[PDB]
Scaffold this motif. Sequence first.
Motif, short mmCIF file in Angstrom:
data_model
loop_
_atom_site.label_atom_id
_atom_site.label_comp_id
_atom_site.label_asym_id
_atom_site.label_seq_id
_atom_site.Cartn_x
_atom_site.Cartn_y
_atom_site.Cartn_z
N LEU A 1 23.41 -49.56 78.45
CA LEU A 1 23.95 -48.60 79.32
C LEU A 1 22.48 -47.93 80.08
CD1 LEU A 1 26.92 -47.07 77.73
CD2 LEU A 1 26.86 -48.38 79.86
N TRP B 1 27.98 -54.16 86.86
CA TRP B 1 27.40 -53.29 85.87
C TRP B 1 28.20 -53.53 84.31
CZ3 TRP B 1 23.55 -49.23 86.55
CH2 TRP B 1 22.76 -49.42 87.75
N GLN C 1 16.66 -41.02 91.98
CA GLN C 1 15.86 -41.98 92.57
C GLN C 1 15.97 -43.61 91.84
OE1 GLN C 1 14.30 -41.24 95.69
NE2 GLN C 1 14.30 -43.49 95.97
N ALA D 1 20.39 -48.84 84.26
CA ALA D 1 20.30 -47.49 84.99
C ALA D 1 18.69 -47.52 85.41
CB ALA D 1 20.36 -46.36 84.18
N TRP E 1 18.46 -44.52 90.13
CA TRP E 1 19.79 -45.13 90.07
C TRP E 1 20.09 -45.75 91.45
CZ3 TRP E 1 24.46 -41.10 90.23
CH2 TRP E 1 25.58 -41.94 90.08
N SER F 1 29.06 -51.24 82.30
CA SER F 1 29.98 -50.12 82.20
C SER F 1 31.27 -50.45 82.91
CB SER F 1 29.39 -48.82 82.60
OG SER F 1 28.94 -48.73 84.07
N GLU F 2 31.29 -51.43 83.84
CA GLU F 2 32.33 -51.79 84.63
C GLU F 2 33.09 -52.79 84.09
OE1 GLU F 2 30.23 -52.57 88.31
OE2 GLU F 2 30.36 -50.34 89.15
#
Lengths: 291, 145, 218, 145, 50, 50, 40, 40, 40
Positions: A100, A281, A209, A104, A211, A283-284
Amino acid sequence: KEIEITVGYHSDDETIFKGVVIRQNLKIRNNQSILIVESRDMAVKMTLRRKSKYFYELSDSDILEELISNHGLEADVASTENQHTELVQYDVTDWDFMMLRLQANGLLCLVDDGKVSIQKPDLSSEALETVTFGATILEFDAEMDARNQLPKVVSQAWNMSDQELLEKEGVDPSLETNGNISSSDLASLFDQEEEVLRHGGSKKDGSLQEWANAKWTFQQLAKTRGRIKFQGIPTVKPGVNLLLEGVGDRFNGKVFITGVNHQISEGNWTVDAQFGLNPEWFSESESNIHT
Amino acid sequence: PPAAGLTAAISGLHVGLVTDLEDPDGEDRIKVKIPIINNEEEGVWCRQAFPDAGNERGITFRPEIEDEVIVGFINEDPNDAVVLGMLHSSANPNPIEASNDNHEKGIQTRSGIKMIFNDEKSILQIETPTGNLVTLDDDAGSITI
Amino acid sequence: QQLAKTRGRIKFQGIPTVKPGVNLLLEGVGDRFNGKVFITGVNHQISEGNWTVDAQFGLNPEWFSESESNIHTPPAAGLTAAISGLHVGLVTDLEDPDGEDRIKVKIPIINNEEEGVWCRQAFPDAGNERGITFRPEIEDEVIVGFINEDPNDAVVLGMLHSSANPNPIEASNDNHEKGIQTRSGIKMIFNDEKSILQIETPTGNLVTLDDDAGSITI
Amino acid sequence: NNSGTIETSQSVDRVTHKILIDGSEIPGTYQVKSIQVTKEVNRIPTARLVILDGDAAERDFKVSNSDHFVPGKEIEITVGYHSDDETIFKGVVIRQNLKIRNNQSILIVESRDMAVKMTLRRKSKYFYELSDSDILEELISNHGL
Amino acid sequence: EKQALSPDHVFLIFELAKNVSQEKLDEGTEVDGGKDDTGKKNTYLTSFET
Amino acid sequence: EKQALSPDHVFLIFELAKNVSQEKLDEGTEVDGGKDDTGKKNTYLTSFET
Amino acid sequence: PIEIKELHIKITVDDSEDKQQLVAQCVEQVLDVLKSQKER
Amino acid sequence: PIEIKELHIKITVDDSEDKQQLVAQCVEQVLDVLKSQKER
Amino acid sequence: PIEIKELHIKITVDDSEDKQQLVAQCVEQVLDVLKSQKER
């Protein structure tokens, strides 16, 4: 037990894989009886236990090194500019937490022979070899899809000191990829509105910024995707560049390798090379991250 | 995805302990430990909700070091914690005894200064620890200072 | 987890007695697997002249709550997109057109330019013609929760301070000073260190109870 | 209709079709191997074309290199018997795929209707004194539909 | 040949927050400046430590 | 031929909210006017900057 | 498979059970590919 | 497939590789049907 | 299938449609196994 696999032609062998034995399976059929043995690298140690911890005045790359060294693994991690004053890990594994935090910041994770390497994509290096449709390709699959390109990306959060929102626009890296159609021609085809990344809490400018920049970079690397199958050699590994020729102006050029499959059986060694990234991603797309 | 997909999320409400009331960056935050994560280290800075607040105004009370509080999280992010209120327990008894008649209400501080409202008898009494008091009593029809 | 140690399937000529919850003896498949096995499932297949049975042994380590889908109802009853966690908003209007004592609040992560929506307010004490009532001023910052995660069942839970809206009582780990201060400057302050209660208005009208003096002043 | 058959305007001996891009027919040198069109309640309509292409002796793909099957172009598909054609599908080209196997080489072209514009971006908005059908019309007209 | 560009100079006034007494601002700190007919953003850097 | 349509004119009295002192309302601001027989809405645009 | 959850009922055709063994192998290899994708 | 995530290991039978090519086509068409169902 | 969501486009090979009918049966039995696993 520890296992090591080497392969080559006429006894000119080279190492392909190192790791540890985890499973043993038997299968019996009317006229067949076999044993199947499975193994993984040492990084598997990071996926077994959920943890809880407070971190203090560390950058993301100091945290990534700590998570890895805890399991006795070797590491090589690119640095970052930002520093957190506190960060919380809660009821997750070390591997998942690491993934994660790394995305990022626009980083890719490469694991190879016990070493964990965390780096930004490198599209500048020399190609290892040339693979040609009319001479060396056995199989080929490729795809182009206009819906993955963006016209611009902006991120938002709440500014409690000023009592307003904080907005940051990303920067277009203009990545060099294969084919002859610009990401900027595809982006304008269906919807010219900006993509907005929203968070409802309080964030630092440095984080917002990065991200927005990570989001944009990953989509450009998903512009062209595919698979190339050819006679095996020991040097193609995720994180290298190959030169692709003879498949039309839409796809020809230098391609970045994101995955490799080695298959050895019935007299031959072949390799399936994968190019391009999946825009989704961690997390998705991954399940069971949370309790 | 939870907490914008940037971190593991934390669902529901949680209980924490107060460790530090002096905020190094001036945002009026308090530092709180959350025992289900870690009950030994210092904790994180949280924002506090008040019943009334504004620019140089409001009702202000703060928890004491080691008080127990209830904590919520903005967008389920573990580092956007907000303190919503304080809790009582047998380890920290409520100064006014419970009853279904609910006759007694009021304020009592650390040093013993009280302000109590008695509904049954219509009495308001303000009193300090060493006998200085003002009483308004409708069951007597009198005012005493 | 121990019952998940060894798992598998055995196919053989059918009989009517193998049912989940029985033991069979397994032989001839190597020292790693030989022994008594606990049966967790059965499949009977009858066709084209024969009856065979597939016996399953060992348990799957996964729990019901982890592997099965649709146990719970979709967010905000499946009728609208849901909003999770707590959010921060701004107050724009205190006069409720339909008499439910609601206040209108903007939520900046949705839209920071329009008027906002009507929210219910929580109070420390409330009832039929009683309670402790304070309301936020126009443009005050508040913390908002949502019933059943529905964006249009918002509730105001409290007010917030920040450097743009400073707290009138300076923070300290000694925590000696507590009290109430209004918009116009009327104060009521409790000093624990000195056991002093002081009530005072903006132009000098005051009442003080002071145990460090042993006196009462009006 | 009790005739025992399916009523068509012509004999079903010869099936014909046309593919139009940006108003005109693709040149009769292109060989279309297969056509598929689907429509369903509560989904966005789609279509697929399979075109033969690629030559190992030249090292290229001539149809792929053309400007006919480029994402963004408008496509229309008509079909019928003995040139009695009727329109089945209208939409926009979105994807282009190539496939190579030991003795096979093809091009696959995909398209969707215009409604696809409504599935690309997440939004936030307050609506006021509207019925659900006023809201539905607004959401649609925003994309020029 | 043609002559090249010269950058411009500004002065800014600062205000400290309520709970601090004295601090040091680093040399080379980036300052936000605006946008161009391209939409990109201008940057100004600090000259000396103060 | 037939003659074309002429648009109508209105005056609006505005009132500001409690916490603001002066504000500028730009030209072209859209004003909302009801619905006609057909059900589509009426629109009026402000004339000058105020 | 090590689970009875993944077996299908056997229906043959009197066209006159070789095709029964080929379809059963294809269901076995699909469900192994789906299980391996959920690995970390 | 455009992904190496969906390939299966090749095991043949000495019954004396035509059947290897048929099973590999069936895994390819199943996973394309599963991907198309998640489209809007 | 009772749904048009699960049909695949038909591509044949001029190798000279028996193999078309075998692949279509394998997609049918896989998707029935996946549906039965979500039963209680």
